């Protein structure tokens, strides 16, 4: 009965901002590291931004450093992705994914984020973010 | 694992943490240690799986270290084969033929790829063991982070003494302890490796199986003698 659900997808003007949210039902999201991955038209899945279960560690793809901000609320069972200064290059389907990090590894979530999300336990169906002059 | 030091990214890169799955999105529970003997095969103890011998219940993690970054694509493994020794029996205190094989694969179906943090361990030559008194090293999460320690092989004659274990020790087993009785394997180290040198090559000589107490005087840790299970092992592996 475990479900991950993204929300916040829409159509925004280049330079605009948009906030995504990932909510879980059926389990406690706070035990899990969360990663935002995206697939743009034509390209393969890439890690946008990731965060550890407690929120102490984060990682960002170079493409979005200084523009995106990931955060979470383990009381409300959510993880958010704040997107500022949006560019057409950001147009894609954005997925939320959750993975339990076993004890005995480094504190970093960098390798969690740089590998296209292969092996991530749980996945949402994804939400569409489109940046265009058509907005 | 009583006493010793915490390992790093190049210490015991063959060690495998074996977890049991919980219902729903609850994080898994640590169950046993194990050793990567082939890119696709982990060796552990049968008594770790006798309650729930179906492979779907478990997940294996590799490359554990405080300096290694967790990558689920290469360090998490599902079990596509769970093989317990067909003549595993539980005696009064000892396990007999306490050995099991787990065939592993990533989410994309790959086996373990060697790295700074993930290496296989060599099997012993048939019926060949390090001399008694040799320094072997044990490793585990047993009684937060991976630890390793050094124990010495104990002869069967010494081990089969009445004030030790008597006739509950056979020659398909291996005894090892600290001469100062201060270091030893404990609850939660089950299935983990006993690494001895044979011809100056690190070798999986033992699999943590049982013992009365932990680092208790006159009672050393008992191990499955891997050198006597090669035919069995390679009968399933290759």
Author numbering:
A (entry chain B): 1 to 135
B (entry chain A): 16 to 37, 37A, 37B, 37C, 37D, 37E, 38 to 60, 60A, ...
Q: What did the publication describing this PDB structure actually write?
A:
The conformational change in the 70s loop exposes the hydrophobic cleft into which Nb7 binds. The closed-to-open conformational change in the 70s loop of muPA disrupts the polar interaction network between the 70s and 140s loops, which is normally observed in crystal structures of trypsin-like serine proteases in their substrate-bound state including the muPA:Nb22 structure. Kinetic analysis revealed a mixed-type inhibition mechanism where Nb7 binds with the same affinity to substrate-free and substrate-bound muPA. Whereas the biochemical data showed that Nb7 inhibits muPA activity by impairing the function of the S1 specificity pocket, the muPA:Nb7 complex crystallized with the active site of muPA in its substrate-bound conformation.
In this study we have solved five crystal structures of the catalytic serine protease domain of muPA in the absence and presence of allosteric molecules and/or substrate-like molecules.
